[PDB]
Amino acid sequence: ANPLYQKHIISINDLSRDDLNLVLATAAKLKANPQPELLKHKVIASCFFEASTRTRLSFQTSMHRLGASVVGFSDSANTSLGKKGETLADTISVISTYVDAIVMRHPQEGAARLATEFSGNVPVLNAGDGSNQHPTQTLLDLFTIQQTEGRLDNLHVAMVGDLKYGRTVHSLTQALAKFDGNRFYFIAPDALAMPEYILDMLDEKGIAWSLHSSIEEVMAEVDILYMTRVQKERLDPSEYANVKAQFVLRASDLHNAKANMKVLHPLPRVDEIATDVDKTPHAWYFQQAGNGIFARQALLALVLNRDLVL
């Protein structure tokens, strides 16, 4: 039996360094040697209560690349869903009667772990539950860093953008904090800063981090540069715009960057990575997005197959 067989995947905080490795391992095998009828005859609900089409297109593509059937919805707009008195608990109790695995994204925190209480023997994969978790994104990011950097230990990772509200930067800092010798550079306005609970955690596990004022002081040193969507609407119109310089990345800046360095972004990217960066060997956020197929595949393969032989 495999350590993740039939496990619900709800939070990065729940997975171990080993669990992480095994998932990044399998992602690599499957990316190399495809398994198109692995999950023949399985049906997975893809329940996106909140619509978020890149995570969804990725997950359903992954499910199809293993042989599975997909049923589900894309609500938020609305279907006969999320309303009038039907609880999520009675909704999950019915779909688990139907399908082999529930992949679900919800507007509210804690929903996939609530899903877990009612899903019987059917595994629940969290595709984001409010501001809380999104493991599956952290997983592709880890496989992208592992594939480009050869390692998940001992790296120089800079975190740029809104680190306050970044549910992505928060899990990658906690996932990466399980391996060793990593140095973190946080580069945010003081207003959109990396939380104390994160910083406690880090200092507590003995890890080196520093706040910096410009991408610029860090560039010489960095291995991974993870950009983040600033929510323009999470600051005043005059406050976003007013910096001095800004927190946008343009190709010029990258002149001091190491040959191994990559720029990573969860996307949508709007103001923050200038399109001239795309032409650079450093830009790697589309290829990252692409690794979403293999890490996501990996997941479903390990959750649904007892002893996966590869």
Partner: protein, 146 residues
């Protein structure tokens, strides 16, 4: 350098990659008289300079100050009959009009048939430009960028 005109202005030691911007921004070009522009010359120090000569035109007084944010050490020469009858450098104006765009996007400037107006304050260090309409203040870096 390049030599003699009579009765015209000559603005010398523009920075370099700035002389054109002054031709664009300040619409100096839309003229009938001979204009001559030297870009990437020398003839007066600090290595790099563009130079602009507009004959039979004189950039009277607050028009020279409007150059200060872009060419603060520029020298503007009033020429008449082959000689420099006067020379003035730009000084910081109380207000910069028409060429800047308000950094704040909920500002009304952006949709209306109004020209910008920024009042100016602090000097040869930060300079804060405040908007006529939304009244927000900004560093000139920010205003003179994106």
């Amino acid at each position: 350098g390049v030599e003699a005109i009579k009765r015209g202005t000559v603005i010398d030691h523009i920075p370099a990659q700035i002389g054109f911007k002054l031709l664009s921004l300040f619409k100096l070009t839309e003229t009938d008289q001979r204009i001559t522009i030297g870009l990437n010359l020398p003839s007066g120090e600090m290595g790099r300079k563009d130079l602009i000569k507009i004959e039979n035109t004189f950039l009277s007084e607050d028009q020279v100050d409007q150059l200060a944010l872009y060419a603060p050490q520029a020298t503007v020469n009033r020429i008449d009959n082959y000689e420099v009858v006067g020379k003035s450098r730009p000084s910081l104006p109380e207000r910069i009009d028409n060429v800047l765009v308000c950094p704040n996007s909920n500002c009304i400037s952006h949709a209306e048939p109004v020209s910008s107006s920024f009042a100016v304050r602090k000097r040869a260090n930060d300079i804060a430009l405040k908007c006529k309409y939304c009244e927000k203040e900004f560093s000139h870096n920010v205003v003179l960028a994106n």
